[PDB]
Design a binder for these strands. Structure first.
Ligand SMILES: Nc1ncnc2c1ncn2[C@H]1C[C@H](O)[C@@H](COP(=O)(O)OP(=O)(O)OP(=O)(O)O)O1
Ligand SMILES: [Ca+2]
Ligand SMILES: [Ca+2]
Ligand SMILES: [Ca+2]
Length: 341
DNA sequence: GGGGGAAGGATTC
DNA sequence: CATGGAATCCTTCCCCC
């Protein structure tokens, strides 16, 4: 089995560059403005020019403007990036029937029944990067290995605008030297727990009694990591389907007032239903982000689909439940619909 | 004991 | 200071044969 992972370079920003080439060259910062104060919000992402000075996804626009006060700042245009993505995604389909679209800019392809070896996989890679570059003018990074996991790691090493292969020879070397924290699905919280257990490299998971690993990080993560170090990780490329659709917004100011919060919530439901586009959910959740950035949600499943009408009143109940049960203020409020018929 | 769904949350990207 | 959409997994209940 041969997997080929494709990850579009600094996507949102590069899309902005494509639409207005004049940007090419200057540091571009695509940010999500939260309507609170001036320039309140976080950075969705930035092109590498800006990344060099520490302006990256996650940080306050405010901190960004402080570092690069003269960089170009754009308001994230999701639908646009989304449509561009869908196109780039379609091209890959022309390279493999089996395609797993991981995110707005990631895809895995099972190029087993199309290639015989890694030399040919690499070629197919270059051929792909080139296609997308002509058709859309979008630079992407390619990763190629024996399984999805190492395929991604491959790309992680090669970006930006790179193409790398991780042959069975290197796969073994990495299992031995790759910092466990660079393994997908291993965030800070998990990586730190792994340190305390002494586990610092994929292999290290072998030097520990299973059960203790399962207790410290969970059975799922355990079996996953272990199957990686044992070189037996082999999950197939599966077409994934949307199981949930929601939307959350940020309020001008924190609140615990049902009448002041209702609007925001009702707005979230509006967009949510619009995105359902003929999809009917039997489950609704009200999600709330407390002033101290904590997250609490209250949901409910129904034996029948949900009308917007229903969703409206039901969501007010759950919000009331949140308020009655959580003394803190609410910073962000939203809804999430799932369990589509 | 144990299947199985629901709810609230944790963690990742 | 701190956006935001969505998947997967974990723990705890709960109904019940
Ligand atoms: N914190 C975030 N908030 C909103 N959108 C985000 C955030 N982080 C990432 N994204 C989105 C926009 C990114 O361009 C996109 C695709 O891949 P991702 O690796 O996350 O970013 P990227 O393309 O900018 O980085 P890279 O060029 O290093 O691969 O995901
Ligand atoms: Ca990317
Ligand atoms: Ca990505
Ligand atoms: Ca990591």
């Amino acid at each position: 089995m041969i997997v080929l992972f494709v990850d579009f370079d600094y996507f949102y920003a590069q899309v902005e560059e494509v639409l207005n080439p004049s940007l090419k060259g200057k540091p571009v910062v695509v940010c999500v403005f939260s309507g609170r104060f001036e320039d309140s919000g976080a950075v969705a992402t930035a092109n590498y020019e800006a990344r060099k000075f520490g302006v990256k996804a996650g940080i306050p626009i405010v901190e960004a403007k402080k570092i690069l006060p003269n960089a170009v700042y754009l308001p994230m245009r999701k639908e646009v990036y989304q449509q561009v993505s869908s196109r780039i995604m379609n091209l890959l389909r022309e390279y493999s029937e089996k395609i797993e679209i991981a995110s707005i800019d990631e895809a895995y392809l099972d190029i087993s029944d199309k290639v015989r070896d890694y030399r040919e996989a690499y070629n197919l890679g270059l051929e792909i990067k080139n296609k997308i570059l002509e058709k859309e003018k979008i630079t992407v990074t390619v990763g190629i290995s024996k399984n999805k996991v190492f395929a991604k790691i491959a790309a992680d090493m090669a970006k930006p605008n790179g193409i790398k292969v991780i042959d069975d020879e290197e796969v073994k070397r990495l299992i031995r030297e790759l910092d466990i924290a660079d393994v997908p699905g291993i965030g800070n919280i998990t990586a730190e727990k792994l340190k305390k257990l002494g586990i610092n490299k994929l292999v290290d998971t072998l030097s520990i009694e299973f059960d203790k690993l399962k207790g410290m990080i969970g059975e799922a993560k355990a079996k996953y990591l272990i199957s990686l170090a044992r070189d037996e990780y082999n999950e197939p490329i599966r077409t994934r389907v949307r199981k949930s659709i929601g939307r959350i917004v940020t309020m001008k100011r924190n609140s615990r007032n049902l009448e002041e919060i209702k609007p925001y919530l009702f707005r979230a439901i509006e967009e949510s239903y619009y995105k359902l586009d003929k999809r009917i959910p039997k489950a609704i959740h009200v999600v709330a982000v407390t002033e101290d950035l904590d997250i609490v949600s209250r949901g409910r499943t129904f034996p029948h689909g949900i009308s917007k009408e229903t969703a409206y009143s039901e969501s007010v109940k759950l919000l009331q439940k949140i308020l009655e049960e959580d003394e803190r203020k609410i910073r962000r409020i939203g809804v999430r619909f799932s369990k589509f018929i």
